Structure 1
Amino acid sequence: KLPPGWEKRMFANGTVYYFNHITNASQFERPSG
């Protein structure tokens, strides 16, 4: 499902986003790569 290095992440207010654990990058939209 999810591409390499990405993992799902979430704010203290309950808002979900995406985080790259290899690069420390982050984004709201679901990652294609």
Structure 2
Amino acid sequence: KLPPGWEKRMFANGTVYYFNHITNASQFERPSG
């Protein structure tokens, strides 16, 4: 589905984004590394 450590996450206002649990990185666009 997603690259190593990445998973979907969401803000309290209902806005969805991508988050890396291993590196603490974040993106509004679907990740590739």
Normalised by the size of structure 2, how large is the TM-score? 0.84
* RMSD over equivalenced CA pairs, Å: 0.7
**Runs of at least 4 residues of structure 1 off by over 2 A?**
none
Cα distance in 1 between the residues matched to 2:6 and 2:32: 10
Q: Identity, % of aligned pairs?
A: 100
* Alpha-carbon shift at residue 32 of structure 1 (Å): 1.4
Number of residue-to-residue matches in the alignment: 33
Normalised by the size of structure 1, how large is the TM-score? 0.84
